[PDB]
Amino acid sequence: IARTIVLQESIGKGRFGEVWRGKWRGEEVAVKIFSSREERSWFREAEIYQTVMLRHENILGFIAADNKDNGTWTQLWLVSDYHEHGSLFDYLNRYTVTVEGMIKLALSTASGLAHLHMEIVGTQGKPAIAHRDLKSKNILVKKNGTCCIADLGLAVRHDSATDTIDIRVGTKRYMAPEVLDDSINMKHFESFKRADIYAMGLVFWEIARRCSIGGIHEDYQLPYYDLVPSDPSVEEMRKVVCEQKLRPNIPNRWQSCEALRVMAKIMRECWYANGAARLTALRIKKTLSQLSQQEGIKM
Ligand SMILES: Cc1cccc(C2=C(c3ccc4ncccc4n3)CNN2)n1
Numbered sequence: 206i207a208r209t210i211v212l213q214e215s216i217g218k219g220r221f222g223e224v225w226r227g228k229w230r231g232e233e234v235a236v237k238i239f240s241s242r243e244e245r246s247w248f249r250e251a252e253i254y255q256t257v258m259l260r261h262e263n264i265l266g267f268i269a270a271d272n273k274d275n276g277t278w279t280q281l282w283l284v285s286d287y288h289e290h291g292s293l294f295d296y297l298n299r300y301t302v303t304v305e306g307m308i309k310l311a312l313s314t315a316s317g318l319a320h321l322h323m324e325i326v327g328t329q330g331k332p333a334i335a336h337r338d339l340k341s342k343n344i345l346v347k348k349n350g351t352c353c354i355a356d357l358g359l360a361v362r363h364d365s366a367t368d369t370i371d372i373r374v375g376t377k378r379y380m381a382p383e384v385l386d387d388s389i390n391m392k393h394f395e396s397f398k399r400a401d402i403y404a405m406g407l408v409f410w411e412i413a414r415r416c417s418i419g420g421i422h423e424d425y426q427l428p429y430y431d432l433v434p435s436d437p438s439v440e441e442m443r444k445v446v447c448e449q450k451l452r453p454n455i456p457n458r459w460q461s462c463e464a465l466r467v468m469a470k471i472m473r474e475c476w477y478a479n480g481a482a483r484l485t486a487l488r489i490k491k492t493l494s495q496l497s498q499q500e501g502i503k504m
Pocket of ligand 1: 224
């Protein structure tokens with residue numbers, strides 16, 4: 206596996222390890238490399254990706270986990286499909302999207318999250334999973350304009366049998382209110398799903414801003430760009446999200462389009478201070494699916 210892959214270009218670095226663009230038998234693939242001391246993170250992400258029935262079009266396609274000794278030290282590898290466009294973050298910074306395009310990005314993301322959160326009952330069943338670090342930089346855009354979720358290293362799996370998790374972290378900017386004020390019940394798996402929804406609402410806000418209507422659109426911005434410094438601390442985020450109770454601003458322009466109106470509504474229903482009041486990934490997917498069948502465009 207890793208023995209025949211040739212690294213060609215450095216393309217990114219997440220919380221742990223670094224991502225490279227490799228070549229396997231002539232085919233481009235993405236390789237995430239971890240150091241020996243990062244074995245726990247490497248192992249956990251390999252573990253999540255190897256979850257029974259995890260594969261889904263809206264989830265990064267996992268190829269394999271492997272070790273590679275260069276003669277001095279050993280590298281811990283995770284190999285996956287390669288997606289030229291890169292992260293949703295990079296995509297939205299470089300391009301603007303049409304109504305159909307925005308819907309495809311949002312729907313695919315919601316479908317990907319719904320799959321993760323959904324428990325598949327059966328002999329070869331799939332446990333429910335919460336991501337815990339959803340954001341535009343952890344989502345990838347495929348050549349067909351659809352998104353797939355990546356970086357599952359912090360994910361948690363639920364055992365409905367006894368209602369327990371198999372095991373604050375994540376990106377401060379996208380942390381849900383209950384996480385920022387640390388009021389979240391770590392023992393309740395449902396709380397992790399709801400926190401994921403809050404984050405996805407922020408992502409939907411990033412996409413919508415880039416929806417170019419009649420040549421009109423807003424420039425790319427991360428959520429809360431107008432309220433907190435770059436790389437904000439938990440305290441800075443808490444004061445804005447928890448105390449002042451602010452959320453990303455919804456442009457007036459969005460009212461001149463039924464598509465943006467539906468999106469805007471979904472956003473609000475994702476940002477409720479109380480996770481139990483937020484929409485579900487499935488409900489969101491259904492809503493966007495119907496909105497999609499309206500305009501008319503590939504799902
Ligand atoms: C499990 C695994 C293997 C290799 C890379 C990744 C990964 C990411 C990834 C995947 C494909 C890419 N294609 C192009 C550019 C960046 C990419 N990043 C992002 N976060 N983790 N994950």
